[PDB]
Design a protein around this ligand. Structure first.
Ligand SMILES: C=C(Oc1cccc(C(=O)O)c1)C(=O)O
Ligand SMILES: C=C(Oc1cccc(C(=O)O)c1)C(=O)O
Lengths: 278, 280
């Protein structure tokens, strides 16, 4: 039977979806599209065999997952789709209410780490669906990912004079490091039961990622007919995202794990098992 | 501006078309929904979809509210392989017998009833149930199946358990000498009039995807053979036996079928099939 594969419905993986379709890879998958927190729960509990895992959930389940090398959802500098929208400066958020988008697990933890250990504020956090308008009427700041964040950063922010802090840029300023928000991984039991299929799926993901980068202009032009963003914005977003996952990216994962591990539920020296090649 | 909500039959008959939609990138212009043909018909008719496949009987019941796509359909000229009657006794011995009808079907089940009533002259006790040959064959004397269940019964379960499998396309061909159309592609009338361009663009993309799927049918069969119960040769045979044309000879078959079942199925015998007009 076809491997059950997850796919983030956000725009960040729309070019990858293009690559999976153009190559015919989709027809080897039983694909499930959803938000990253749902896809992580599904893979961890066994409703999926392979799929994207938000980094915090992967590190909490590192013993049961095998990450795919050379592909991830990340950035080196700004990421555009992970932001803090605030009505006041970040240093004035201590004791204030900050809304956390329900879809996120890694970016919200990154935002909490930055606000606590870089800016030194301790706000009262709460979780709610990602809706800027609603969040801005009930809290002083909001952490968003996905299309909601890109909409807040490129449209709603400038239109209503709200500060939009790029979480990738804040992490780059703080540490000089890139960041990895999500990785691709297979369940350990599936990887050991089907080593061949796991490798073929991994190789197909790399091939689809490679083609999407070569055809990024075609992806942006097509998506521009249906999204709120124009072709230039989408092409910039697709090219600003960093889909590599090598030594410099793993270094960023290691440092992030060290800083949040003791207060998030996984060891500071947690090990990331990578899928070995034949 | 939002992507058109497009249906797609999950059966193997439209797997090559899905390959074509993916390879061309057309999928990324769609909000695609995969399901069985009876659900996809309900969804489009009630407004949950904008464009999609409609089993012919349901299309004719709603012909005033739908606009059929020319030059693409799910049909056959002779055997169709995926629409069959599986019977433990000869067809002429089914009078008063139990015949199970697969819930997934609307057109083939009506075709089977038409053939059994007006060609073979039997009047069995029909009942509808989920498509499960094992269950049907232990509980009824015959069963009408479509989709992967029918193809499995025709190519695998049938010969394995010594059961007669009558191809519904072939029976219709023997009876009338005509091809048959089981499902058509159509847009909601309100959507076609609100978005004529998108409707035409979707129609043209379906034709392009259909054309490419026929050119690369070998690659489709080879890939699908890794995951399905059927081998590559069987899949390639099925994909090439299916007839995806929808022109004058196919509409002629629809007209004749509508005339024979219309008075007893819920649409006029003289029902009109509105085709999407091309730009001048
Ligand atoms: C690039 C992004 O960063 C992500 C992606 C997936 C999950 C998360 C998370 O916060 O769990 C963040 C984006 O949202 O587009
Ligand atoms: C070729 C087939 O014929 C069909 C297709 C779709 C719907 C129906 C129906 O009976 O409603 C029949 C197949 O099932 O593969």
């Amino acid at each position: 039977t076809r491997p059950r594969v997850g796919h983030i419905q956000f725009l960040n993986c729309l070019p990858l979806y293009w690559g999976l379709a153009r190559t015919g890879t989709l027809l080897d998958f039983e694909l499930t599209k959803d938000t990253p927190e749902k896809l992580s729960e599904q893979l961890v509990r066994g409703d999926l065999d392979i799929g994207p895992v938000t980094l915090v959930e992967f590190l909490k389940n590192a013993d049961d997952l095998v990450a795919f090398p050379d592909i991830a959802v990340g950035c080196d500098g700004p990421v555009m789709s992970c932001v803090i929208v605030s009505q006041v400066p970040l240093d004035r958020l201590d004791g204030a209410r900050v809304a956390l988008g329900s879809t996120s697990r890694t970016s919200v933890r990154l935002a909490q780490l930055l606000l606590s250990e870089r800016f030194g504020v301790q706000p009262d956090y709460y979780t709610c669906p990602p809706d800027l308008s609603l969040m801005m009427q009930e809290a002083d700041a909001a952490v968003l990912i996905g299309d909601a964040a890109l909409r807040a950063n490129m449209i709603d922010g400038p239109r209503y004079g709200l500060d939009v802090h790029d979480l990738g840029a804040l992490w780059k300023e703080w540490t000089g490091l890139p960041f990895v928000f999500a990785v691709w991984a297979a369940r350990r039991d599936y990887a050991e039961r089907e080593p061949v299929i796991t490798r073929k799926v991994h190789e197909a993901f790399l091939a689809s990622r490679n083609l999407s980068l070569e055809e990024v202009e075609k992806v942006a032009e097509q998506a521009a007919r249906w999204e709120a963003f124009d072709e230039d914005t989408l092409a910039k977003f697709f090219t600003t995202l960093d889909f590599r996952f090598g030594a410099p990216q793993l270094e960023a994962v290691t440092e992030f794990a060290r800083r949040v591990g003791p207060t998030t539920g996984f060891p500071a020296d947690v090990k990331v098992e990578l899928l070995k090649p034949l």
